[PDB]
Amino acid sequence: PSKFSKEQLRTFQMIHENFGRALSTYLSGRLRTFVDVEISIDQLTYEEFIRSVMIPSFIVIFTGDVFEGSAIFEMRLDLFYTMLDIIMGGPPNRPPTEIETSIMRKEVTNMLTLLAQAWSDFQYFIPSIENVETNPQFVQIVPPNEIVLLVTASVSWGEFTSFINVCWPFSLLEPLLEK
């Protein structure tokens, strides 16, 4: 089938809610302030997701040994620059420099690892960042009409609220969908 079943969605909801809790603790420690995270999932076409991403943005294309194909970890630039500023102790809306992406790549590797830990009992993997892009219109990892599981993490602290989205293409998740 081309779409995710109801029960399969619930499994992914629980997995990513675990991710959400680990992420909250992670970001709270990095930003040294209480950061709340609320997870919500949905399934839609890849086209819909990519068209919703701001230009520019911080798009991390990643994979895992145990997967075949890529997935996307996207972070809004307002969060990206706010996080970086705090970690560095130093937003600009323009696309990030190579230095800024390199510093934030380390943070993303940490967050992807937490994601993998949440996926432990179902399909544990070691994340590998394949590419980093700043323009969503240049990102077409799978066909437009293909369905994708979109995990949205609403990240907030104080009066700031932003997002981190993980896009899991149906084609990538198909085999685990089996067992």
From Swiss-Prot:
Q: Which UniProt keywords apply?
A: Bacterial flagellum, Cell inner membrane, Cell membrane, Chemotaxis, Flagellar rotation, Membrane
Q: How does it sit in the membrane?
A: Peripheral membrane protein
| Molecular function terms, GO-annotated | cytoskeletal motor activity
Question: Can you list the GO cellular component terms from the UniProt entry?
Answer: bacterial-type flagellum basal body; plasma membrane
* Primary subcellular site in the record, as a coarse category: membrane
One biological process GO term for this chain?
Answer: positive chemotaxis
- Keyword Cell membrane (UniProt): yes
Q: In terms of domain of life, where is this protein from? A: Bacteria
Q: Where in the cell is it found?
A: Cell inner membrane; Bacterial flagellum basal body
Which residue spans adopt a coiled-coil conformation according to this UniProt entry? none
Subunit-structure text: Interacts (via N-terminus) with unphosphorylated CheY. Interacts (via central domain) with FliG (via central domain or via central domain and C-terminus).
Family classification = Belongs to the FliM family.
Query: What role does this protein play?
Result: FliM is one of three proteins (FliG, FliN, FliM) that forms the rotor-mounted switch complex (C ring), located at the base of the basal body. This complex interacts with the CheY and CheX chemotaxis proteins, in addition to contacting components of the motor that determine the direction of flagellar rotation.
Name by which UniProt lists this protein: Flagellar motor switch protein FliM
Q: Which residues of the full protein are shown?
A: 44 to 226 of 328
